[PDB]
Amino acid sequence: LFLAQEIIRKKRDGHALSDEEIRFFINGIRDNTISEGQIAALAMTIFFHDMTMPERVSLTMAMRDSGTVLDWKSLHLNGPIVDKHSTGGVGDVTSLMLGPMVAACGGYIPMISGRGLGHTGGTLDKLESIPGFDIFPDDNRFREIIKDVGVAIIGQTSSLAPADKRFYATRDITATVDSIPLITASILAKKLAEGLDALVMDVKVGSGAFMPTYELSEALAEAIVGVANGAGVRTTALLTDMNQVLASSAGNAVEVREAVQFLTGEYRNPRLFDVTMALCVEMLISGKLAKDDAEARAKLQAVLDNGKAAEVFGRMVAAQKGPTDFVENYAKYLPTAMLTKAVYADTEGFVSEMDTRALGMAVVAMGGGRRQASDTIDYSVGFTDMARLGDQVDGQRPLAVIHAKDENNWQEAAKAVKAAIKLADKAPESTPTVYRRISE
Amino acid sequence: LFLAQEIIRKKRDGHALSDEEIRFFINGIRDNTISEGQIAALAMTIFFHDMTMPERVSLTMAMRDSGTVLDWKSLHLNGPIVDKHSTGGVGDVTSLMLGPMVAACGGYIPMISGRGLGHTGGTLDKLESIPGFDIFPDDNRFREIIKDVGVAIIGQTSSLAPADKRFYATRDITATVDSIPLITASILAKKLAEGLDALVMDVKVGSGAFMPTYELSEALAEAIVGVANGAGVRTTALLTDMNQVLASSAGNAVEVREAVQFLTGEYRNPRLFDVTMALCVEMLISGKLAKDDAEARAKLQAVLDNGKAAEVFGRMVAAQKGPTDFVENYAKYLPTAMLTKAVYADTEGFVSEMDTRALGMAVVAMGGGRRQASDTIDYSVGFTDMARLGDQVDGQRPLAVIHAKDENNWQEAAKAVKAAIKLADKAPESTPTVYRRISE
Numbered sequence A, B: 001l002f003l004a005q006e007i008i009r010k011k012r013d014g015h016a017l018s019d020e021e022i023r024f025f026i027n028g029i030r031d032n033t034i035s036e037g038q039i040a041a042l043a044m045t046i047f048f049h050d051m052t053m054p055e056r057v058s059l060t061m062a063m064r065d066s067g068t069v070l071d072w073k074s075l076h077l078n079g080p081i082v083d084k085h086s087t088g089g090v091g092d093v094t095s096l097m098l099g100p101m102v103a104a105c106g107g108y109i110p111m112i113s114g115r116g117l118g119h120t121g122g123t124l125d126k127l128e129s130i131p132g133f134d135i136f137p138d139d140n141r142f143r144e145i146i147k148d149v150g151v152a153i154i155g156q157t158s159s160l161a162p163a164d165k166r167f168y169a170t171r172d173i174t175a176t177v178d179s180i181p182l183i184t185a186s187i188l189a190k191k192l193a194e195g196l197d198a199l200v201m202d203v204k205v206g207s208g209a210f211m212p213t214y215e216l217s218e219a220l221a222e223a224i225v226g227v228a229n230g231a232g233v234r235t236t237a238l239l240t241d242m243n244q245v246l247a248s249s250a251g252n253a254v255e256v257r258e259a260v261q262f263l264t265g266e267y268r269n270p271r272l273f274d275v276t277m278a279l280c281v282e283m284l285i286s287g288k289l290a291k292d293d294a295e296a297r298a299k300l301q302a303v304l305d306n307g308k309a310a311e312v313f314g315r316m317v318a319a320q321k322g323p324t325d326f327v328e329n330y331a332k333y334l335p336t337a338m339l340t341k342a343v344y345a346d347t348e349g350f351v352s353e354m355d356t357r358a359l360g361m362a363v364v365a366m367g368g369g370r371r372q373a374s375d376t377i378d379y380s381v382g383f384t385d386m387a388r389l390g391d392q393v394d395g396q397r398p399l400a401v402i403h404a405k406d407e408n409n410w411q412e413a414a415k416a417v418k419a420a421i422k423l424a425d426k427a428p429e430s431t432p433t434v435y436r437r438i439s440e
Helices: A004-012 A020-030 A036-049 A054-065 A096-103 A122-126 A139-148 A165-173 A180-192 A214-230 A252-264 A270-287 A293-305 A310-320 A326-333 A356-368 A407-420 B004-011 B020-031 B036-049 B053-066 B095-103 B123-127 B141-149 B164-176 B180-192 B214-230 B253-263 B270-286 B295-307 B308-319 B328-335 B356-368 B407-420
Strands: A082-086 A109-113 A151-157 A196-206 A234-241 A249-251 A339-343 A348-356 A382-384 A402-405 A423-424 A434-438 B084-086 B109-111 B150-157 B198-203 B234-241 B249-251 B339-343 B350-352 B382-384 B402-406 B421-424 B436-437
Touching: A004 A020, A004 A180, A020 A054, A020 A165, A020 A402, A020 B350, A036 A165, A036 A348, A036 B036, A054 A165, A054 A180, A054 A214, A054 A348, A082 A096, A082 A109, A082 A180, A082 A270, A096 A122, A096 A151, A096 A252, A096 A270, A096 A293, A109 A139, A122 A151, A122 A252, A122 A407, A139 A310, A165 B004, A180 A196, A180 A214, A180 B036, A180 B164, A196 A214, A196 A270, A196 B109, A196 B234, A214 A234, A214 B020, A214 B036, A234 A270, A249 A252, A249 A356, A252 A270, A252 A293, A252 A310, A252 A326, A252 A382, A252 B308, A270 A434, A270 B053, A293 A310, A293 B164, A310 B402, A326 B053, A339 A407, A356 A382, A356 A407, A356 B150, A423 B214, A434 B164, A434 B308, B004 B020, B004 B036, B004 B109, B020 B164, B020 B253, B036 B180, B053 B180, B053 B214, B084 B109, B084 B180, B084 B270, B095 B123, B095 B150, B095 B295, B095 B308, B095 B421, B109 B421, B123 B150, B123 B253, B141 B150, B141 B308, B141 B421, B164 B180, B180 B198, B180 B214, B198 B214, B198 B270, B214 B339, B214 B402, B234 B270, B249 B356, B253 B308, B253 B328, B253 B339, B270 B295, B270 B436, B295 B308, B308 B328, B339 B407, B356 B382, B356 B407, B402 B407
Parallel strands: A082 A196, A109 A151, A196 A234, B084 B198, B109 B150, B198 B234
Antiparallel strands: A234 A434, A249 A382, A339 A402, A348 A423, A382 A402, B234 B436, B249 B382, B339 B402, B350 B421, B382 B402
């Protein structure tokens, strides 16, 4: 349909839009044939009226199609194309172990990530700590890496869902941001644009989730599973705990060091392991690489214990121009911070609360993050040996270990870490790491 | 308040905006500090949530204030400053007789009109038929004319409610046009900007009204009376019949000829007279120049019968550079069309329906209107001796008399006039000329 101002009228009156109408409107945003006012108007209408399932699907596919949509039919891969998605999280290094693990199990992960623009962190920034890691390989090479190794973590090709670039911009200045149908469409957009067979969204829950209330997180996860499956991608979602840093480290290089240690069995944070393992079985069942949670967990664990998990990670790194011996000699390659010093709480007790947001920001303000989204970042700075909720902190139990560039840099950090971790007399109730698996 | 994106959020959540917030937002539109998207977003929210009375008042005053607001305190006029407003209407020449009539009765009408940009017609275009009429006198002169004569009909000073210029533009392309609080605010905007003591809106009703349903017209009129009085201007409104041309003529010069004949008693269309007389008593009671509809109608009629009405009109014209003897010698001054020829209906019967819109457009397409809103208009073309609903049309009763510039120009016109006036076997029910007086 034509006339973007009549498309608005239609929805505004509580009516629903047809595929053709949404496709036309989304493309108009891309080609600049639809004005900012017309975008914000349609957006405000969708906020009030919401969108039905077939409209929700159409919005996501209209956007995914506005740009590029990768195809692996020519690669003649005898295995499912699977990948994972999330809504961000401080210390959520899971993607680094997930890739190898599922690749070692028959999958293929064309993990096209984006550069971390703020707070939450960035998985590509993490990988750029590895001396000579290349996140921008050409398509031919990228496909070469998927076929040969099974996984690759690269940066976006800027041609992925461009209609979403200007759509979010307007929503960002018109108060039409917080709207489930818009959010789900935007989130799946670029991710479905990889040509996935099966997806698995990781909707964080808690004092650091994308959504404010658990009810909202749950609401988003069900809506994502709906549109995703409606897009043809066998998708499932999981509500995961995000009331404290997932891994034992928050930063760039320090997280990459935890990712290799988890793979080589050197060390595995109990919590990080549950969520990482949970996300993989989904990918294994959706990808049809296992049929029972028991068979899936028997598959992933083997790889984790027999080395193949670490190996695929190695081959991935070497294939993306990193060191051929990174897994074994990572200590020699990863940047070590100038001043590594621990921080203890002013008083003793138990960790009751944790502001992951404040923590994520501190790392940003410490160097491990792009402030202006253009300024360079220190890959050595971050947190390690973080204290988990429920842990006691005395004169011998630090809240965390700060890797700063200098005393003043460590000063800000320490105060921040102190101000984000609340202590108590008694340790709080233990919360589940994986709440529920939204599916079917 | 600051942040136009948070002002949006406030209203969007069903909350109400304070004066300061609306004033800030309206000014931001004027100064270009608020984007088109932010305008359309707030607009879409107001469409859903509507506005309370104090918000409705604030929107109108925020806009009236964005530009110029005339003041007559310095003029030391011992009389009320009153004026009339309307929502358009084909053949609504009423403003030309209303001015003198109320001026002759102690009032002062600073009638700042706008150039007719389409269909509905334009009162300024009408007056530009008079050889040498000056609709753009400087403020000093304008005030000189009000003080000396009592009325003046001029064009806008472009400094009247500029925030409304860009507000309507966006609404016009985002489907946020049809919203009572927005419309009332926009309509009173420039009109209150004259510094009125008492106003009287003429909300047309019927097959040519601004609103579609009588219910809607009535809805608008009550909302206008609410915000107007809330602005401090003693306002009333009237629902007037608009299911056929109000006057016996539709055009520029041909309407000016009817306006002088109504004033000199030469000829007065029964219907045009009721509405014209009705509008004046309102102005007389609101202006406190009479206290009973009986005293008002006894006042206006005297002036109409004793000549003073025609005289003030004359003095107005002469004062705005028109002919000193226009009232008496108008026939010598007003442009006479090339081809004056009548049109009869293909069949005989009774006028049952009339598409004033189609009629208004025909005049536009005949020359009496600005198509591109920049192109010149023929002041001689139009309709005269129009047939009223209920009249019989035989071989001796034409539907109207067309004043065209040539046969082909008369051809289009005749077919149009034919296609807009439906005939029947029996004459339809007689409808009221003035439905109801909305007030207090």
